[PDB]
Amino acid sequence: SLFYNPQKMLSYDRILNFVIGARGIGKSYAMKVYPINRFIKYGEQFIYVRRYKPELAKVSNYFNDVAQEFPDHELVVKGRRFYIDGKLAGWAIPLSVWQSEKSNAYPNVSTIVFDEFIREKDNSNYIPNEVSALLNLMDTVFRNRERVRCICLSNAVSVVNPYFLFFNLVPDVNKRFNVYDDALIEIPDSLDFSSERRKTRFGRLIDGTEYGEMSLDNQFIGDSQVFIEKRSKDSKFVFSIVYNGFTLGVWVDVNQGLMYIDTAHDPSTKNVYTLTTDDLNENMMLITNYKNNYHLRKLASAFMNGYLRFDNQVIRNIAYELFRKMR
Amino acid sequence: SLFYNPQKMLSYDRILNFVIGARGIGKSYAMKVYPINRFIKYGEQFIYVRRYKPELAKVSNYFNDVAQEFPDHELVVKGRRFYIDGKLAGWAIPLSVWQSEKSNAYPNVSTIVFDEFIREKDNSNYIPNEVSALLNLMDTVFRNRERVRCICLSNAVSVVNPYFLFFNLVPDVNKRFNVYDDALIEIPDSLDFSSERRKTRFGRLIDGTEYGEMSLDNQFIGDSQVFIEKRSKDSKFVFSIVYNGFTLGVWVDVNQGLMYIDTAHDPSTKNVYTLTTDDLNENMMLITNYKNNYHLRKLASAFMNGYLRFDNQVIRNIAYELFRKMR
Amino acid sequence: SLFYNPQKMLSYDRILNFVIGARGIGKSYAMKVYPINRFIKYGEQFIYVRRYKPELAKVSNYFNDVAQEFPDHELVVKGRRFYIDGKLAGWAIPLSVWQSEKSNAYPNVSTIVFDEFIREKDNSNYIPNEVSALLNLMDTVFRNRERVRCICLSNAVSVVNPYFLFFNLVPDVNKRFNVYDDALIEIPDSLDFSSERRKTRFGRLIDGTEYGEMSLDNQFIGDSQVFIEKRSKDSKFVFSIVYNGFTLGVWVDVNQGLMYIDTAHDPSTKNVYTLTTDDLNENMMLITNYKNNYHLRKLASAFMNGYLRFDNQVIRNIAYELFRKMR
Amino acid sequence: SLFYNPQKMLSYDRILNFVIGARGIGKSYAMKVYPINRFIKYGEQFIYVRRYKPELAKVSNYFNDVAQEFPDHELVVKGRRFYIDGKLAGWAIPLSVWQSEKSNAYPNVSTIVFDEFIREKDNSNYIPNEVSALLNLMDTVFRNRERVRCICLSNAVSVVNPYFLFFNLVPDVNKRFNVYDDALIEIPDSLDFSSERRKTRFGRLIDGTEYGEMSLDNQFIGDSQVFIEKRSKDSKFVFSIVYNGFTLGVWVDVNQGLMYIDTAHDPSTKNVYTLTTDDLNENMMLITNYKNNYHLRKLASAFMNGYLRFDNQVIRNIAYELFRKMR
Amino acid sequence: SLFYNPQKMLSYDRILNFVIGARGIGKSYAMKVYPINRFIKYGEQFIYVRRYKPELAKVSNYFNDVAQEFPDHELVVKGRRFYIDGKLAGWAIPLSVWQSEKSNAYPNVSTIVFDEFIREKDNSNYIPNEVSALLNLMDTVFRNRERVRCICLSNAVSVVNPYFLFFNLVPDVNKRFNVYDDALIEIPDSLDFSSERRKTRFGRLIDGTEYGEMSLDNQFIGDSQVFIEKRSKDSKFVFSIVYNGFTLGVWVDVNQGLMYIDTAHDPSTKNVYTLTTDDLNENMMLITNYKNNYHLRKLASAFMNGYLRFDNQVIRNIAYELFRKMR
Ligand SMILES: Nc1ncnc2c1ncn2[C@@H]1O[C@H](COP(=O)(O)OP(=O)(O)OP(O)(O)=S)[C@@H](O)[C@H]1O
Ligand SMILES: Nc1ncnc2c1ncn2[C@@H]1O[C@H](COP(=O)(O)OP(=O)(O)OP(O)(O)=S)[C@@H](O)[C@H]1O
Ligand SMILES: Nc1ncnc2c1ncn2[C@@H]1O[C@H](COP(=O)(O)OP(=O)(O)OP(O)(O)=S)[C@@H](O)[C@H]1O
Ligand SMILES: [Mg+2]
Ligand SMILES: [Mg+2]
Ligand SMILES: [Mg+2]
């Protein structure tokens, strides 16, 4: 039948599953045809979350088109109310319109799906405190923790969303499913998706020119800050510096005379330095602004040239801000 | 002659036309007539995007100035929706919520019936990457390669907006048309320019001399952004200043000594200078505040003098911004 | 009389009505009444024009104070709607919001209405492209050759303002009215101001004592920067600069050896000091805060001493602003 | 008694009523009882005045605490307007939105009330020439002569004020009312000082410590800043300064070098110096780059020593800010 | 004891209340439970005082536990307010804006809530005269002190802060209950986080992640501000200084080359240093920052290395700041 069925991501037993990164043409129908069926089978109530209030008028549609699947049950949709057997089965909620839903009747639900969670192509429009609210949302509208499902379908090709900014996820393009103790990021039908888009440019060559626009192909490309060098030695080393309560050693090597800055503490503890007296101690000395720079003339020249290398991007940023303060 | 004349625009028949000029001077007249002409031919309904929502509460009189074009049949508005003899005419919405629209069926489109797509000196209105927003709009008004023909229409001619140089849309003041695969750059006849500007000279003499200023001249002729003297020559590559991710270099031609800022490459592997740490890696060298004025002594002096010359407008803008950064 | 009516001013029929200062002369309510009379007797629509959107309370602040003076006619206030004798002809017009203007069809308004024209010590966030904005509005409404008038009044006598400077008008207290090829200027009388000053002094001693204060003088006579010395002379020419639009040319007189500043410029290949590259070209020269001071120490020491006299008021203004920039 | 009593305050009944002292002792409530007594029995309309937008929005609550005073009448705030007995009784107008509001309706005005006309522990957050905006208000309200009042209320005696310094008044700390033909300066009674202070002490003992805190005394008896040394002597002077439109003389003592800054400005061709660029005369000299340090060495050292002595509070402060601007 | 009991704090029932050094798990839990229950049983209004504007969105997320203690009370978040059972409970405002909202009088406030009056291990930028502004608020809202309290919670144990120095407090952190006439200082037992956090985590892991908010971890950790030894020496002093109204006298012990910073300083003819004009008087001597080193080279050197000593861990604050004034 259909290539993709959410049965795998449901049976994974993971509390949090994220079907994010595809069109949703088959996906949304796939996991919208099941919940009404679970209601009819085991009285299992269901909630869909639209991104915001005006989307309530866009959710009444599907009950009509699912007619072929649901012949023998009376189908009614009344704003938020979902009526099957002339009875309440599901509820659709906006994120900002939440107050009236706090006292609303949600006896037992194990599904909350976010669709179009990001306002697509607004000026990064933010819904106030999405996840700071969502924590109490999950613990409140749902009954318990045993068998609770918090899912997010996506249509936008999002390298990250503010929800991810909170949870701080680290997925990969390779792993179709990204499973953890709690969470699971799923990238749907990646090849077919791409193929499913290919064919539409055959239906319209001007859409071929539109695809040729680097904007369409650059949302498949992520951008961020990147590391510089990941280096270490196996030989002698001399200096030591500390800043903002964090210590950075200095490594040297005679072979090519190279110079690295890697984590190294010397209980011998000579010439330990800071830029600012917020890290004062009887051992360290408040460095003169630039004379100590000339003392570390080799370090200065290594910064000017390529002779300075490091083993982290975090060490990169700390060292770089120190360099900016150095002059 | 007399008015705005879309005959050549319709004639050369790009699937996507691109015209500019005539601020309020019928740049919207003929193009609001044309959808009703398609309706008298009994074609398809049109789509009207708006920049924002308040702009909608007053604009229900969209057919007032086309009655004197076509007094014959019924051209009215029931409210938000436009009706010609009672049949649906225009799908009329601002930008904010097109995503909620994009799952609806849109089988009938005729033409693009919006103007002031981009306003001069107006980016607070703008939405980030709205060029791809128009891409989503077009693909959600596409069913095949037919039924659609598009126009852009800015009040004046500029060469700095992302769309142009993204498509290398280059205006020509000697010739009316500039032709590409699908993109045209045009303006009404220079003879029609003479006729209509002379018509404005007639009557309100103050409204004529206000056109005598370049203030009202540039709105319709579009002579803008060509500010610095600019040339090019065959000198040798000497220096290159990697700034914010650019391979900018300097040609120095001693015969008739001037510095030309054209872009090129040689395997110099030296003399490449960076003014930021983000553009620095382990094969180029960093330069602090003053040392640019000394190592690029030729650059500094030729900038202070009139001896510095330029090649391209984008290079001119980024170089002046750099000249602001260098202190 | 009590409240002068501007028909004698309107007699000349130039579109621009530059009335300045006149705190409390009743130009406000005269320009309220006049379009009402025009609509009543002929049928011409009217629009109350301000600069910004946020003011909505001016539904009642404009129309109540002038509602009663009409003896035997009907008026209706419907928010942004104004009705005279059951005829809808009046609405509020914001300038900061230009976009709604470019959608709205123009009501046939004989004269645009505007007082509080000048900004006195505002936050300086006025409308950019201000004179261009007024030109765009004038072109937008009545694109035909039918003539349209405008009335604009300033709270206090600011001798130079962006539009006044822009169209190179010049003020003259001695002659109340002023006429050019396409311009009309006007100044308030002194008899009415004297009468009102006696009214305040005899009425209450608070404003009787406040009359001797500077601010009340400014409310009638409009104290400006004219007080500083302002003369020119026919001495020999010495030096020349260009500053963001004005080509200052400075003369020197050995007799008493002072220095004079005039807008007259000597066409000469001598070095011209440009403070900003926005005036850079082949022959001008860019200079920074040190060497301009070192080579124009003549000018600077002459300025701190009593050794400068300016030809024109705008010359004084631009010279002082430039000196502030240099400081 | 404990309540704030305005009987002797109205005993003179002048329009400029600077009411000082008794921080937060219900003087503002005693005000609030007044415009009710005026409007209800007479129909006159009142004006509420405060600097900034938060105090514009929540003025209803400041009227809500009035909903207990007059039971029979109806007191409702619609929008940001006060309705007493179902009729419009007053308006609350902020200052910063001032110019546009100059054209507000004043069919009749009773009292323009402004708490905290002195700034409270802030950083120069005075609307520049706030006095100009206030006096423009009184000018605009002055169309209906009879019974106009402009009440301004504060909480501490302070010659550190644009107001008192601007009107060149000499306040007193013991004369219960410093009166002129137009204005009043009120220091509250003595018995109620003790009454409220014992009230604070009895209610709580850290309130007694506040009674030991000099801040409470300043908010009760006022800071005249008389503490800084002050004297004068017949001895002559060397230099002469003008700052912020005020002359200034530097008396020099024959013996002991006790420098005086008394206002002894003899009209002389002697050298006179300023620092603010607004001060320029044909007779006097400007000073820059710390030349004044090399001219008045003895004054600089004398202030850096205990030698200097200031004749007047206005003189003393003005010298302070001049020193602040010097560096 | 597993649960902190705010009964312990209100058993001593002092008006001035400082709950400091809490871990903010059980202390925050109980403190959150306290006030709404107190109002519900009796009735009270509360103010949620905070630092700045960016934290205005944090207040809307506060009832994650209290509603759990109220299975039958519905607390609805209305923007920046809370409604208990549909009734406006109190209000939440950033502290600094209160100065603008200074003069507003509120009916009868019982508990004045504040959190983290001391902000530890950060920038900790504090507006000048914060304590004076807080006392201004206290004076503003109070006439009758019948059972009114000002409660503040901070998660730090430290005697160096604006408030303790302001009130001349000397609480010893080793103990757990120091008292003043109307103030109380306590340190809650650290073992209070357990039964609040790892019980609800030991239940289920997804519950432990439900705890979260990612901010409890900052408060739980504790740090000691002591850097070097604090001692007093029996060798006599040489120089003395006065800073921001806080005196100081530097002592020297030639043996072992030490210097001490005991505040106890002997007045004599030797006039002290000063750094700002306000602090200056008719007897003391003031110096510029550069000549400060040329007076106390030994102070300079003791700031370079670790020669200088201290007498109290709070003194190190004044020393650090005055060092920064040296620049
Ligand atoms: N075929 C035409 N017949 C008559 N007038 C025309 C014709 N074409 C253009 N015009 C002129 O165009 C004016 C109205 O054109 P508009 O629709 O305003 O064009 P526009 O440039 O879009 O200006 P805006 O900003 O859209 S209102 C009329 O008042 C005429 O002066
Ligand atoms: N038709 C009228 N009926 C009655 N009073 C009028 C009329 N026209 C003007 N006035 C008077 O004009 C006086 C001045 O009010 P405004 O009309 O606001 O003056 P204004 O000239 O706009 O002041 P400026 O120049 O804008 S600062 C008022 O006191 C009115 O009584
Ligand atoms: N008749 C009254 N008797 C006693 N206290 C009163 C009375 N009327 C008001 N108050 C109280 O006075 C206090 C301060 O209110 P305000 O009227 O604003 O004081 P104020 O004198 O105006 O000083 P500010 O700076 O305006 S708050 C409040 O606590 C009121 O409850
Ligand atoms: Mg148009
Ligand atoms: Mg006016
Ligand atoms: Mg008050």
CSV table of N, CA, C and O in Angstrom, one decimal, chain B residues 7-9 11-12 14 17-18 170-172 174-179 184-187:
chain,number,residue,atom,x,y,z
B,7,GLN,N,-0.1,46.8,-24.5
B,7,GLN,CA,-0.2,46.0,-25.7
B,7,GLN,C,1.1,45.3,-25.9
B,7,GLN,O,1.1,44.1,-26.2
B,8,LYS,N,2.3,46.0,-25.9
B,8,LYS,CA,3.6,45.3,-26.1
B,8,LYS,C,3.8,44.3,-25.0
B,8,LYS,O,4.4,43.2,-25.3
B,9,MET,N,3.5,44.6,-23.7
B,9,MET,CA,3.6,43.7,-22.6
B,9,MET,C,2.9,42.4,-22.9
B,9,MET,O,3.5,41.3,-22.8
B,11,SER,N,2.0,41.4,-25.7
B,11,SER,CA,2.4,40.9,-27.0
B,11,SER,C,3.7,40.0,-26.9
B,11,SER,O,3.6,38.8,-27.3
B,12,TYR,N,4.8,40.5,-26.4
B,12,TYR,CA,6.0,39.7,-26.3
B,12,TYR,C,5.8,38.5,-25.5
B,12,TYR,O,6.7,37.6,-25.6
B,14,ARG,N,5.9,36.9,-22.4
B,14,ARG,CA,6.5,36.1,-21.3
B,14,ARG,C,5.4,35.4,-20.5
B,14,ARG,O,4.3,36.0,-20.3
B,17,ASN,N,5.5,38.4,-17.1
B,17,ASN,CA,6.0,39.7,-17.4
B,17,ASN,C,6.5,40.4,-16.2
B,17,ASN,O,6.3,40.1,-15.1
B,18,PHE,N,7.3,41.5,-16.5
B,18,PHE,CA,8.0,42.3,-15.4
B,18,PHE,C,8.1,43.7,-15.9
B,18,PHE,O,9.0,44.0,-16.7
B,170,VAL,N,18.7,43.8,-15.5
B,170,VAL,CA,19.6,45.0,-15.7
B,170,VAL,C,18.7,46.0,-16.6
B,170,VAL,O,18.2,45.6,-17.6
B,171,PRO,N,18.5,47.2,-16.1
B,171,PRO,CA,17.8,48.2,-16.9
B,171,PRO,C,18.6,48.8,-18.0
B,171,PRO,O,19.8,49.0,-17.8
B,172,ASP,N,18.0,49.3,-19.0
B,172,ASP,CA,18.6,50.0,-20.1
B,172,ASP,C,17.8,51.2,-20.4
B,172,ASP,O,16.6,51.2,-20.6
B,174,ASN,N,18.7,53.5,-22.9
B,174,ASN,CA,18.7,53.8,-24.3
B,174,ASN,C,17.6,53.0,-25.0
B,174,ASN,O,16.8,53.5,-25.9
B,175,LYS,N,17.4,51.7,-24.7
B,175,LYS,CA,16.4,50.9,-25.3
B,175,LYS,C,15.3,50.5,-24.2
B,175,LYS,O,15.6,50.3,-23.0
B,176,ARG,N,14.1,50.4,-24.7
B,176,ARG,CA,13.0,50.1,-23.8
B,176,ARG,C,13.0,48.7,-23.2
B,176,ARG,O,12.9,48.6,-22.0
B,177,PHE,N,13.2,47.7,-24.0
B,177,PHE,CA,13.2,46.3,-23.6
B,177,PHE,C,14.6,45.8,-23.3
B,177,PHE,O,15.5,46.1,-23.9
B,178,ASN,N,14.6,45.0,-22.2
B,178,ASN,CA,15.7,44.1,-21.9
B,178,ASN,C,15.1,42.7,-21.8
B,178,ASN,O,14.2,42.5,-21.0
B,179,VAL,N,15.7,41.7,-22.5
B,179,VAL,CA,15.1,40.4,-22.7
B,179,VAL,C,15.9,39.3,-22.1
B,179,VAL,O,17.2,39.4,-22.2
B,184,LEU,N,11.6,40.4,-18.7
B,184,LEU,CA,11.7,41.6,-19.4
B,184,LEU,C,11.8,42.8,-18.5
B,184,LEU,O,11.2,42.8,-17.4
B,185,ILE,N,12.6,43.8,-18.9
B,185,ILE,CA,12.7,45.0,-18.2
B,185,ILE,C,12.3,46.1,-19.2
B,185,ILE,O,12.9,46.2,-20.3
B,186,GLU,N,11.3,46.9,-18.8
B,186,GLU,CA,10.8,47.9,-19.8
B,186,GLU,C,10.3,49.1,-19.0
B,186,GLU,O,10.5,49.3,-17.8
B,187,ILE,N,9.6,50.0,-19.8
B,187,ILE,CA,9.2,51.3,-19.4
B,187,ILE,C,8.3,51.8,-20.5
B,187,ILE,O,8.5,51.3,-21.6
